[PDB]
Amino acid sequence: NPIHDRTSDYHKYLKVKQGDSDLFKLTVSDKRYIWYNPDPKERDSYECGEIVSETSDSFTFKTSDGQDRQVKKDDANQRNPIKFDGVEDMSELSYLNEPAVFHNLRVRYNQDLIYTYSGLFLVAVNPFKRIPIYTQEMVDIFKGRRRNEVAPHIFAISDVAYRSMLDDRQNQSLLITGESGAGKTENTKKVIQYLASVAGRNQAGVLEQQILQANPILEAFGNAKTTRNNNSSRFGKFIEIQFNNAGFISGASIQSYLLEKSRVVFQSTSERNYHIFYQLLAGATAEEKKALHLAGPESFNYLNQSGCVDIKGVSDEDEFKITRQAMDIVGFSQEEQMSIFKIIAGILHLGNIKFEKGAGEGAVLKDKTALNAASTVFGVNPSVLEKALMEPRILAGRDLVAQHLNVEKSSSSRDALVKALYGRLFLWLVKKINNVLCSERKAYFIGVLDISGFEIFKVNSFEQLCINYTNEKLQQFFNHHMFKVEQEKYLKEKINLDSQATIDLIDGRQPPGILALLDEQSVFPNATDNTLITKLHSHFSKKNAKYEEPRFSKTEFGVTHYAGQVMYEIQDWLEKNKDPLQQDLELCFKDSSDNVVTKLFNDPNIASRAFLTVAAQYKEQLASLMATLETTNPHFVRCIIPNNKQLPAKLEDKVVLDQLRCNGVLEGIRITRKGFPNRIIYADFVKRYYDLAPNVPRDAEDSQKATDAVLKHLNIDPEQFRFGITKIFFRAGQLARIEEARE
Ligand SMILES: CNc1ccccc1C(=O)O[C@H]1C[C@H](n2cnc3c(N)ncnc32)O[C@@H]1COP(=O)(O)OP(=O)(O)O
Ligand code: BEF
Ligand SMILES: [Mg+2]
Numbered sequence: 001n002p003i004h005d006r007t008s009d010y011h012k013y014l015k016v017k018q019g020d021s022d023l024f025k026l027t028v029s030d031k032r033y034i035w036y037n038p039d040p041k042e043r044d045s046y047e048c049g050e051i052v053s054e055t056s057d058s059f060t061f062k063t064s065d066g067q068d069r070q071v072k073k074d075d076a077n078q079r080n081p082i083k084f085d086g087v088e089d090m091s092e093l094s095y096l097n098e099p100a101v102f103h104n105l106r107v108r109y110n111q112d113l114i115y116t117y118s119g120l121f122l123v124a125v126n127p128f129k130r131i132p133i134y135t136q137e138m139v140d141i142f143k144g145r146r147r148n149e150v151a152p153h154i155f156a157i158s159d160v161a162y163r164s165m166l167d168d169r170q171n172q173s174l175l176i177t178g179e180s181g182a183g184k185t186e187n188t189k190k191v192i193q194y195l196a197s198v199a200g201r202n203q204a205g206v207l208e209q210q211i212l213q214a215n216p217i218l219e220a221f222g223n224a225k226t227t228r229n230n231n232s233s234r235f236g237k238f239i240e241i242q243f244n245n246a247g248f249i250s251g252a253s254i255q256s257y258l259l260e261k262s263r264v265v266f267q268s269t270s271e272r273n274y275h276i277f278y279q280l281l282a283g284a285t286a287e288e289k290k291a292l293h294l295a296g297p298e299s300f301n302y303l304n305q306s307g308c309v310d311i312k313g314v315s316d317e318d319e320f321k322i323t324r325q326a327m328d329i330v331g332f333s334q335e336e337q338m339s340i341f342k343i344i345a346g347i348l349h350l351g352n353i354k355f356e357k358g359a360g361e362g363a364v365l366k367d368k369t370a371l372n373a374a375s376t377v378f379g380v381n382p383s384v385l386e387k388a389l390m391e392p393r394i395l396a397g398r399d400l401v402a403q404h405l406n407v408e409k410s411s412s413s414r415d416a417l418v419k420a421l422y423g424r425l426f427l428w429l430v431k432k433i434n435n436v437l438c439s440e441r442k443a444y445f446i447g448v449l450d451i452s453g454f455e456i457f458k459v460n461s462f463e464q465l466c467i468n469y470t471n472e473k474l475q476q477f478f479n480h481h482m483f484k485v486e487q488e489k490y491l492k493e494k495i496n497l498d499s500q501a502t503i504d505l506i507d508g509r510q511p512p513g514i515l516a517l518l519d520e521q522s523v524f525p526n527a528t529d530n531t532l533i534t535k536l537h538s539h540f541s542k543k544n545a546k547y548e549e550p551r552f553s554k555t556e557f558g559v560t561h562y563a564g565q566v567m568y569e570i571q572d573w574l575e576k577n578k579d580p581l582q583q584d585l586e587l588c589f590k591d592s593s594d595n596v597v598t599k600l601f602n603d604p605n606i607a608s609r610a611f612l613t614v615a616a617q618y619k620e621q622l623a624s625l626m627a628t629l630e631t632t633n634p635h636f637v638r639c640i641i642p643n644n645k646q647l648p649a650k651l652e653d654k655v656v657l658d659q660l661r662c663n664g665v666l667e668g669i670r671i672t673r674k675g676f677p678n679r680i681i682y683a684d685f686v687k688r689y690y691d692l693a694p695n696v697p698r699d700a701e702d703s704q705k706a707t708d709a710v711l712k713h714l715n716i717d718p719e720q721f722r723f724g725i726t727k728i729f730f731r732a733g734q735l736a737r738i739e740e741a742r743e
Contacts, residue, residue: 002141003150010141013133014151016086016111024688024743032740033079034061035099036069044654046099048079079103081739088152089117094736096673098666102657109642109651115152118638118665119672120482122157125640125656126183129648134190139197154187157635158194161446164633166247172446173632175474177453178639178663181229181646187637188239188450189215195241195446199249207437211241211252213326214433220279220323221426222259225272228644230311234260234274235426236451236467238625242442251439256430257451257621258463261419264347267306275319277303278310280344283320292345293373302351302418331436339596342377343425349374350418355390355407362404363390379593388584389413413582420581421589424600424607431606447632449625454563454662462576465514465568466618468561469506472499473626475562475664481634482668486675493724496675502561505546507619511539514559515615522577522613533557533570563662577613638663676722676729682707685728691743704728714741 002008006018035046049061052068060070077097084093085107093100101118108116109125116123132138133153142155144163150156161172174191176184192211200208219231226232235256242251267273281297288294297303310316327337352370355363365371365386375382390410393402405413454471455464476499490496506514517535521527536557541549548558548565558567589601601607609617640659642651660666669677682703690696690706693713700706707728711721716738722729 002137003145009132010138010151013112013131014115014153016108016113024691027081027083029082034059034071035077035079035097035103036061036063036071038064042654044102044657046077046102046653078733078736081736083739084736086111086113089119090123090669091117091119091672091677091679094678094730094733094739096669096677096732098657098660101660101666101669102653105656106651106653113152115154115156117147117152119668120478120485120636121665121668122152122154122635122637123640123665124154124183124187124637125642125651126181127648128642128646128650134193136197139194142194143198154190154637155194157637158191159198161633161635162195162198162247165243165444165446168633169444171444171632173449173629173634174446174637175449175629175634176637176639177449177451177471177474179228179453179455179641179659180226180232182453182639182641182659184450184452184639185219185223185231185233187639188448191448192239192241196249199243199247201248207251208249210330211249211437213329214252214254214437216322216326217330217429217433218254218256220276220319221274221429222256224260224263224267224274225308225311227268227270229646230314231275233450234263236449236470238447238449238451238628240445240447242439243444243446245443247444250442252437253434254430255621255625256426258466258618259423259426260463261423264418264422265302265351265415269306270308271306272308272311273303273306275316276323276344277348278316279320279323280341282316283318283324284341288341292342292377293349294345300348300351302348330433332432336432336596339594340425340429342379342594343421343596346374346377347418347421349377350414350421353389353414355410355414357407360404361406363407363410365390378589378597380588380591380597384588384591385585388582388588389417392582392584394582413585416579416581417585420579420585421600425596427606428596428599428603447628449629453638454561454566456563456566456662460566460568461571462568462573462614464566465506465559468559468563468566469503469618470622470625472503472506472562473622475499476503477626477629477634478636478664482671486672489679493679493727493729495722495724495729499562502546502559505540505544505559514540515619518573518577518615519613521574527574529555529570529572529574532573536570562664577615579614638665673732675731677732678730678735679724679727680730680735681727686710689738689741692738692741710738714738 002010005011032051034049034051036049037043038045038047047064049063049069051059051061053060054073058070058072059076060068062068077099078095080093080095080100085104087093087104090101090104093104105116105123105125112127112131114125114127114131139155142150142153142159145156145159147156147160157174161174164170165172176187178184196208196212222235223231223233236258238255240253241249242253244250263273272278278297281294284292284294297309303309324337349370353365354367356366357363368382371382371386375385387402390405391402392405392413393400451470452467455467457464479499504513509516514536517539518532521532521535533555537549540547546560550556550558550567555571556567556569558565586601589597592598592601599606640656643655686696686700686703686706687698689710690698693710695709695713696706704723716734720731720734
């Protein structure tokens, strides 16, 4: 039992190291500390100041420099007793303030303990280095173990979900959120690995293997190197791991959301386009290249712009193999693989099209190589394509007349074509995989949601509003959940909004919210960003409290979200809402000779939305997701990025705290701390504090009696504590004081 084996990797990597003695006595000290900001120029940077004296109303402490300051007792961030340093659950801290919470996390992270509970949450800080805690051997130890029986780990929460599912006969969910680069995807993969192991059909698993192999496929197509993460997920996902009544994996399903189609045509400097582009061009056999008109990334417009074509310590060609390998396992026919790659090629081809002017104002294609190349790979007719691009037929009422688009318009059209192809292929890939894995007859499921938390960037656009909208919903679901769960707990022992307004501002029907207004402007071909933003301010500036019209910007607006105010820019929202593609182009592609291509334009389930707008579909999909969640027993993982540089051993208070503020961890604690944060099992209490009362012995039968003895001895303030059927409930700071009590 590595759990009992203080020499195991289990103890080494998941636990705070334990010495010989446990004796209350060791941890003894006269000093009493406080956390203070070594200056409010900061606020997240704190220092430990020893309290040198106090008044009936405040404290006076010394600083690091030796400077003596004073603080209101009522404003003081008391430091928890050293014994509390490193606890596995922040719910165990007596003093539940910000700096204190950060401090526990940091003490843990300093020992490479990246997982910590906070009440209902599992907090996970990216180590930005390898920690060998995800082995089969580590898998093995979390089997059937209670949360309180093993160290914090993603495996642990995974096991608890699996057990609850079987014991309660209730579906489960794991919501894994946080910023880009926080560790969501990695943690998601671990949940699945874990489940695959505890519930897979042993012997050697085919379905299991296919389930495992779907990720890789999806990541090649939906993941890219960004400035925040080398393997950034540019789509959100909800994976449903399906089980039969026996608790064995019976299948799975994947739901994808918000794929960043725009990255296909444009990438910021240092970033890359989707991985597959590089995989194909590196891994294609000199023979497939020829057949694909493939060259180097530098030869491609869509890949030669960012300046970055490789990922440190990443072999595209080696990855291509892995990719093709997975497609094989899942079950992509060579023929299908061919066409997917052809689509990939084609898109690269479309990007190399260079529209020219002169003649007049309308665009011309002096050179058609690229065109020819895309047409071939795609299996469409070049001339048709050609005209569909520059001379699309447009409906002027009764009139359907071809228009001669200029360069920019021609260019944008081409871009829209590429984005549609890519999004549709991605959707097709998903469905293909679901076909393989998905079971119409499942008994139970454990769903994992891997999606960004709130996004507050330099520039916030429509996709940002979407994600933040989802986030308000998940936060509200958390709050509701925390509410019942806390109530139930109090009930089993015998004890004691705002999200709506924001949600309504965005998704309301009457009065209409942001999305309803957006949709409305959507029917008007001539509407503009200016008409839209004016309408939004018209309805909400000084009229809706969660809304703010900027002092000078004419193109932005602010929303007061759970995580704070977010300023959104309205440019192109109209276009984004419609996601238009010229009919001619649809017509062109519908006639493709390619087996896969045909599906993308011919299968309405793929080729279309319903038509509803992008906003309406987003809202709908979010509502279905929440509906599903509502039916589950949920578990929450908050992934935290330690800094903005992708470095290990560098936990930045400011970076971290901001995350704790936005993600609900601190709020949760604020709330918790208001009641009876500390809840201790009778025997546990006595075991540690028996010696504080001339009366009680370590292991006593009447533990509750024994508890009251110490308390009584100590003469603790009654309203400071609460006798529960099996635990002693303590208000904030109580236990710390007691800890502070002489033997
Ligand atoms: C296949 N993997 C990649 C492929 C290409 C380049 C980098 C990576 C990528 O995974 O890079 C990773 C891996 C690393 N990481 C996260 N959690 C941990 C963990 N506990 N231990 C160690 N590292 C962690 O941090 C990066 C970001 O994690 P992530 O899970 O992709 O982030 P997100 O929250 O955006 O999904
Ligand atoms: F970049 Be991570 F997938 F949010
Ligand atoms: Mg990810």
